[PDB]
């Protein structure tokens, strides 16, 4: 046989032609291990080769070097390791020159490079790599690919190793990553890749950020790229700014107000779902981190001593400007409605809750005016939001200021049970339950108890969820009895 048209078939559209050559060219795995890899390493290089051949090329080399399951990986790793220092030094060259000549998109080359990568360095057998890639981007005379392709590699390399191995390559690596994100940089495809690389790298550079010289610099570059026109890179930029926020909360005090708040609070109002999600996550993650510190304080306050680390209270401020987005976002909900998807309607509801449990008795006021103001609106959308928001804000706040609140709505909430809109129903049912779990007393009220239960029952023969919610309620109410004795 002749090795090209086979690779063409090594991934063909038919499950038998492929399954065939997928093994034929697997006999030379354990009976030709070396000799093979190389063969491809060149065909993967010479541009003359049709797409498939090339694409399929690295696919095989990539394949036989690494594994998905963190298990077998160990095995297929030492593989190219215990190999002959003859062909390795050969392949490692027919590939570092394949980039810039591949027309396709996710260029296979990046793949294999990274694969070999997690092994030619955890000991240091390929310490000439990093300087070479660096040259691909920092060098102004390089193809839109020559650059892209490269980064792609750098990114996989990070996404596959434990922090400890890359912690001292940072300076060398990062210097390149960021170069791909710069504003003056032409192709957004290079920018993109780069912004991704960062997402996988932030994880191991406490050293880098600790040096103000760089930090300032990184944050500048990330925020700039947050103003890039290509949606493709904005979602990348925010993802970093979100990761960074969970990662380096303490250092963010110098960027939050001048640069970050304006940026993240803006995004949330993006018509684009992907871009909003990111924005919400940010302030969502911020609460998480902040109310977590909130603990550090007390647990270390009763014991009588300085809190190891201190919060800076961002949610509290922006609270005013947040909610009136979170709430207004509790409207961009999917029609057909999928239950496991992650669209703003959720993030908003979720974050609207977390905030409600960190800011405490400060949220009650900023949210009410939206409920009263949307309990009657025609569009069900602005209606269920009203309910939902009332549902969210029941954790955190002191009951000695909710019990009274609910009661006034409690009644006009029951009427929402059989609200002509199917979504208002479901949500109205969900709240009720949440109003039994959190606040037991203020629910069992004669004034509207009799009219209550008689509507919960009525719900048992309704839609699953709803019914499967009246339970979250009846149950709760009962437990509230075994507790009062």
């Amino acid at each position: 046989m002749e090795l090209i048209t086979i690779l063409e078939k090594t991934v063909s559209p038919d499950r038998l032609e492929l399954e065939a050559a997928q093994k034929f060219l697997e006999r030379a795995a354990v009976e030709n291990l070396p000799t093979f890899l190389v063969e491809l390493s060149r065909v993967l290089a010479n541009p003359g080769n049709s797409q498939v051949a090339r694409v399929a090329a690295g696919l095989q080399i990539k394949n036989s070097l690494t594994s998905k399951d963190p298990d077998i990986k160990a095995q297929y790793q030492q593989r190219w390791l215990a190999i002959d220092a003859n062909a390795r030094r050969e392949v490692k060259n027919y590939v570092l020159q394949t980039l810039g000549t591949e027309t396709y998109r996710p260029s296979s080359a990046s793949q294999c490079v990274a694969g070999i990568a997690c092994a030619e360095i955890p000991v240091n057998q390929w310490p000439e790599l990093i300087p070479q890639l660096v040259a691909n981007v920092t060098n102004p005379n390089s193809t839109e690919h020559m650059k892209e392709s490269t980064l792609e590699a750098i990114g996989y390399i990070c996404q596959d190793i434990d922090p400890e191995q890359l912690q001292d390559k940072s300076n060398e690596i990062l210097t390149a990553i960021i170069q791909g994100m710069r504003k003056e940089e032409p192709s957004n495809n290079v920018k993109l890749a780069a912004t991704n690389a960062l997402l996988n790298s932030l994880e191991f550079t406490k050293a880098n950020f600790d040096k103000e010289s760089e930090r300032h610099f990184i944050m500048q570059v990330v925020c700039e790229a947050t103003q890039c026109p290509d949606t493709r890179v904005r979602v990348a930029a925010l993802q970093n700014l979100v990761k960074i926020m969970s990662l380096y909360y303490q250092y963010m005090e110098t960027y939050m107000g001048p640069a970050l708040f304006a940026i993240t609070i803006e995004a949330m109002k993006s018509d684009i779902d992907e871009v909003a999600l990111q924005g919400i996550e940010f302030w969502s993650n911020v609460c998480d981190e902040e109310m977590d510190l909130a603990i550090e304080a007390s647990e270390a306050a009763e014991q009588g001593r300085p809190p190891e680390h201190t919060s800076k209270f961002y949610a509290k401020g922006a609270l005013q400007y947040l909610v009136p987005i979170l709430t207004q976002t509790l409207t961009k909900q999917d029609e057909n409605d999928d239950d496991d998807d992650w669209n703003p309607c959720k993030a908003a509801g979720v974050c609207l809750m977390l905030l409600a449990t960190c800011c405490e008795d400060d949220i009650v006021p900023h949210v009410l005016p939206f409920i009263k103001e949307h309990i009657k609106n025609p569009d069900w959308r602005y209606r269920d939001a009203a309910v939902m928001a009332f549902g969210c804000i029941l954790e955190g706040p002191e009951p000695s200021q909710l019990k009274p609140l609910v009661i006034q709505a409690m009644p006009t909430l029951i009427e929402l049970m059989k609200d002509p809109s199917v979504v208002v129903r479901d949500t109205a049912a969900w709240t009720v339950g949440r109003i039994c779990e959190l606040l037991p007393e203020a629910a069992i009220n004669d004034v509207y108890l009799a009219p209550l239960l008689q509507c919960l029952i009525e719900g048992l023969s309704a839609e699953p969820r709803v019914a499967s919610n009246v339970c979250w309620a009846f149950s709760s109410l009962a437990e509230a009895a075994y507790e009062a004795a």
């Binding site: 991704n196 990111q278 996550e281 979720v350």
Partner: peptide, 28 residues
């Protein structure tokens, strides 16, 4: 073809499970 990622998910305390929301979290 299945390249790397786009990852960024969350929902704290019973993460990617869905439903309207979850239950309380308490202390000492």
């Amino acid at each position: 073809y299945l390249t790397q990622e786009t990852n960024k998910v969350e929902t704290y305390k019973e993460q990617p499970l869905k439903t309207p929301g979850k239950k309380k979290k308490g202390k000492p």
